[PDB]
Amino acid sequence: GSSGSSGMAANLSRNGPALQEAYVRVVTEKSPTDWALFTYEGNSNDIRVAGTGEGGLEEMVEELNSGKVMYAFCRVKDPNSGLPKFVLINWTGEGVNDVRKGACASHVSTMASFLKGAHVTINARAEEDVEPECIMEKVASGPSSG
């Protein structure tokens, strides 16, 4: 029964330090990093860095390519809490077939653990479903009373 290794899933091994690095900046206010994109390398299972900067949410969505599965990691402050919260977005281009959308979902479980701290999770697909307000509207949603 043992042929592959696990059953198709993200590796994040080749670009270990790389990926982690982009994840350490987005969480560390010390360095300049408001967002962080992570896309595959070639045509195999292996998530790597795609883009990083302090442009905010406007620059993050600008990198999002409608057609390929990517991961966006932004860091903003809540309205009431006023504290730095971590947001997780599962960019899923519409151009991607259905057979793939179901095959990439398995990777979400692996990536989800890697990008811990995510106070809120959002599964968008289009650029309109990943706008500053569209995200900030969910960032505020959280425990407060009752």
Swiss-Prot record:
UniProt remark on domains: The SH3 domain mediates interaction with SHANK2, SHANK3 and PRAM1.
Domain ADF-H: 11-140
Quaternary structure and interacting proteins, as annotated: Interacts with SHANK2, SHANK3 and SYN1. Interacts with FGD1 and DNM1. Interacts with ANKRD54. Interacts with COBL. Interacts with WASL and WIPF1. Interacts with MAP4K1 and PRAM1.
Family: Belongs to the ABP1 family.
Localization of this protein: Cytoplasm, Cytoskeleton; Cell projection, Lamellipodium; Cell projection, Ruffle; Cytoplasm, Cell cortex
Protein's UniProt name: Drebrin-like protein
Function: Adapter protein that binds F-actin and DNM1, and thereby plays a role in receptor-mediated endocytosis. Plays a role in the reorganization of the actin cytoskeleton, formation of cell projections, such as neurites, in neuron morphogenesis and synapse formation via its interaction with WASL and COBL. Does not bind G-actin and promote actin polymerization by itself. Required for the formation of organized podosome rosettes. May act as a common effector of antigen receptor-signaling pathways in leukocytes.
Modification(s) after translation: Degraded by caspases during apoptosis.
Location of Phosphothreonine modifications: T33
Full-protein residues shown: 1 to 133 of 430
